[PDB]
DNA sequence: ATGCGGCCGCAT
DNA sequence: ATGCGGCCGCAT
């Protein structure tokens, strides 16, 4: 899908070289500082077929805070060079990376494909991984030790599953009722996904 | 974490927010952290040490309310602690 | 009330605080004079210390290490500690997702080692290493 | 084309190829596991001057690693650099003229990989060897 | 005191060949000939794609001494150069 | 002083001078091992009737066609001086009003031109002050004594570089010759005596 | 996050 | 020598 903030949703379409489609979405969260940022990157090709656009969008998840830049790339191919440069500069991984390694201080890529999901649908893989992370969080709350581990798992979960916390610092997942609520939320997401 | 920053200008490119005139490098400057409407993160609005007090902000105990206060030179710390009371001149 | 013996201790402590501050600033200015940025990077690298981003931070960390000793690696994450107004905060990465939150006022550190190249400037410091540890605000 | 002369010649060219592709394997492994600033740290740690240019940086790093950290010059106290056929001095014997020192057996201490890159040092499999620089035997 | 021919892997793709006038790609093999610069006191290299260099009429007998930085290349590349030198 | 003709403003403008220093310097740099032998003229011209300012750079090989120039019309009446001083200190390593003309390694050296057929050809860059010629004569003295010593060819190289810097020569595209030969030192000493006689002739 | 100016290696 | 593009610290 073409992002509407570019204005070319009609005049153009999303590009795809092979199996990879040039339309990635990354997120980055840090509860200690309150950071919770989203980054959309798209490479759009005209329906005519030979004008090319690099569309960057960034900001705070589910909030007005953010911005975007639409750079009309002159060359039909250097647009891809710029796309890959930005991807590897933001996430620390190559574009066609077999493995989505997480690099410190850098973003993490989300697998996409109305308000409960601020950034859109989610693949069953991400939701399965989030459910397993919630499993680990529940077991660690039963252990009742290492709040730093709770912080780590909370960051991972809030990265895989975006939430609209506004301008408020995301809450830690030390409480058991919170883990149960988020597990019920993930079950709702799973039912909504299987409905499709 | 704090709400107020103070430091010697790491470059003269920054411009004051009241008089809109460029700040000189290695000069004392005070900033207030505000949400950046363009990205997720706080950003400092900078001010000449003289202009900062004319915008209506007042600080009670600079030694804890301001960031990097302990990093300044001593007589500058005392100048800040003095201007905190009253203002300006 | 009490403001004769207690107040005396308070004044003495603030005097020592001023002493340490203007001492470190004299050191910073002398380094600004007799050395270039790359020489300070050499200095930091020699003491196993990480090289920061920014001239100000570079010479600040150099002065810190010189006066109080070369900060050793972190306890858990093996990162690097940095002074931050009130205490030494760790700037390492305990994991690819979260920052390390270590924080102390008495970090582990070996004695600083000025390379012999700047012996010509080392005597410009008059040694004066002193057994003084970092003095923090009340 | 004597057989004794020719056997020795082939042996020497074999050793030459060995050294070349060895140093190139090392250079590529460094290109992989390290950044430019890490290599500058490495050079600074061994008292070596930091050149201008990524290629030159990793070249000098590989040189120092395989054969040892080149010591300062004999007269001018500058820094020596490999130059295809031998080590040329790049110091300044005076403010007007370049130092012209030139040798094939410079003085050098043993290289010292910092422990930070021990994770990559084992990637070199040690294999330091007592091998000195092999030069072309043309003239 | 210096040679007449240089060879190296492109330290950047900004340089452009002198025959085809098409940009040289970075980290690719390229050969240059040193010539006097009519704009300042000093020699400057005219660069060439390794394939174009031989079509300009220059021929080298013994590359191992006639060319600069020959020993710095990769071995199979040294042998490719030594082979193309002939014919 | 004099306006360089390659700028084309010799009529429309004049050479500037702030105080005792005149903004019209000439530097040279020589290295016999590599054959380097370069000249660099730097002038700051002010319009003869107005407030237009020009920064004129010229550089190249001594007494040869190899070289070039750039005439940059500076907009500000004063930033031209900032640019002039920046270029001077970037090329020679010394400040503009330096009490001492220190020689920095790999950098140029400033020559003292006599602002105010032999001169047309024998001196490629123009007249020379008696100070430079005295220093060159002393360097030739040292070269003669070192040739009598017959040792340290690196010292001969150093003195040769210093001399060829202080006294420009039109060697074309050829590497300047070392001053190891005694007859060469005698010839250059006779040349310097000729220069001294030509200078004293001017009264 | 990006914009932008100073800086430095590589071309010419 | 300068021109120019990539890079990185400092502003916003
Ligand atoms: Zn102001
Ligand atoms: Zn830590
Ligand atoms: Zn030397
Ligand atoms: Zn070509």
Coordinates of C-alpha atoms and ligand atoms in Angstrom, one line a residue, chain E residues 16-24 47-53, ligand 4:
Chain E
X16 CA 36.2 8.6 -14.9
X17 CA 38.0 6.7 -17.6
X18 CA 39.9 8.8 -20.2
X19 CA 39.0 6.8 -23.4
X20 CA 35.3 5.9 -22.9
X21 CA 34.8 8.8 -20.5
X22 CA 32.5 6.6 -18.4
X23 CA 32.8 6.7 -14.6
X24 CA 35.2 4.1 -13.0
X47 CA 43.0 6.8 -15.3
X48 CA 41.7 4.0 -17.4
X49 CA 39.5 0.9 -17.0
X50 CA 41.8 -2.1 -17.0
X51 CA 40.3 -3.0 -20.4
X52 CA 40.6 0.4 -22.1
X53 CA 44.2 1.0 -21.0
Ligands
LIG4 ZN1 37.2 3.0 -20.0

